[PDB]
Design a protein around this ligand. Structure first.
Ligand code: CA
Ligand code: CA
Lengths: 123, 123
């Protein structure tokens, strides 16, 4: 799920190294997240975290071992659009949708360098 | 490359178990292939074998370990159409194209049970 989400984000933002640009941004983008999102990018991360939390409730996802970001699915990037594959079973397809949505949200919101590596001393 | 081609064929032929229906069909469909194709399905297999042979000449493919059918790429099946992903590097994208083409060829040609497990005693 993580490398596929990395690839999805580059599908939408071809200039980005997502694992570098969006990890540890604000309160939500990265491992965990808590507190009020600092901006709309952070709010895209918040929704993605909630999406993932939702996925873990599927008995389709519970049939698996992973850190949520290792539920590997199939998607294509074609002309900068993401298509989640009908080959994904239920869990993967749900995560595929979570990841497509966040990649698109990230491409539509402002990126604020101030919130990069934001001091967690109050999220 | 093999499980992705399996998935591609089911994308086009949703009633099929491709690893069962198309393996060891005619002279070409399966490991190797030699002789004159027995029918157009077999000719789709012949073209796919030649495609794979072509791929091995890419220095992009030579940078890898696999049996040709383990050059794993990314594609989506959506509404029974295959899209090879812009995330594939050169070798994978070439194999993705080989596999998409054969899956489509298979869906357009007659399937002849006579040629299933055809006696190789003259291909
Ligand atoms: Ca998070
Ligand atoms: Ca063959």
């Amino acid at each position: 799920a993580l490398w596929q989400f990395n690839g999805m984000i580059k599908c939408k933002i071809p200039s980005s190294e997502p694992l570098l640009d969006f990890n540890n941004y604000g309160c939500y983008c990265g491992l965990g997240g808590s507190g009020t999102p600092v901006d709309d990018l952070d709010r895209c991360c918040q929704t993605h975290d909630n999406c993932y939390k939702q996925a873990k409730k599927l008995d389709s996802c519970k049939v698996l071992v992973d850190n949520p970001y290792t539920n590997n699915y199939s998607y294509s990037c074609s002309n900068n659009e993401i298509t989640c594959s009908s080959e994904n079973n239920a869990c993967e397809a749900f995560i595929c949708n979570c990841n497509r949505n966040a990649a698109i949200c990230f491409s539509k919101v402002p990126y604020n360098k101030e919130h990069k590596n934001l001091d967690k001393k109050n999220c």
